[PDB]
Design a protein around this ligand. Structure first.
Ligand SMILES: [Mg+2]
Ligand SMILES: [Mg+2]
Length: 154
């Protein structure tokens, strides 16, 4: 569903410059080495992105290629954003994510269970903190659904 992911990332980045957006999108669709390089560029904050835009893009990139190490700024952010969740609540979310299977499943899970922002964000934290615990379909689906949610507020 990486095609839909790319589309949502493009929309998420609509307000940045072309070359810049083009540089990011071209890299993330350019293979593992290209995406890795783009993630390093992102975390070093050389591009003129807002803090939230940079962390969002690093999450997208690590979700695509989990060999990319975690950026503390993004990691810490997801921790704070979900700090009010009981461990039991997160346990339920892990199971439900897995059972969701793919993008359509994950989107449906978020909507039909009327998830709060913190619950959505716990799904994103699961894929960012523990990408290897989830299939590519779940990682991409979760991040796509998350980006779709944000873009609908634009
Ligand atoms: Mg965490
Ligand atoms: Mg958490």
């Amino acid at each position: 569903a990486h095609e839909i992911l790319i589309a949502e990332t493009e929309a998420f980045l609509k307000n940045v410059a072309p070359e810049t957006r083009t540089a990011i999108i071209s890299a993330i669709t350019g293979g593992k080495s290209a995406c890795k390089s783009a993630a390093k560029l992102i975390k070093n904050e050389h591009l003129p992105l807002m803090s939230g835009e940079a962390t969002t893009m690093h999450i997208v990139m690590r979700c695509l290629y989990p060999e990319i190490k975690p950026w503390k700024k993004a990691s810490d952010m997801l921790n704070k954003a979900t700090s009010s969740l009981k461990k039991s609540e997160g346990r339920d979310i892990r199971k439900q994510m897995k059972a969701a299977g793919d993008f359509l499943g994950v989107e449906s899970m978020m909507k039909m269970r009327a998830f709060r922002d913190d619950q959505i964000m716990e799904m994103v934290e699961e894929v960012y903190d523990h990408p290897d615990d989830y299939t590519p379909d779940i990682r991409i689906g979760t991040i796509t659904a998350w980006l779709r949610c944000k873009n609908k507020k634009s």
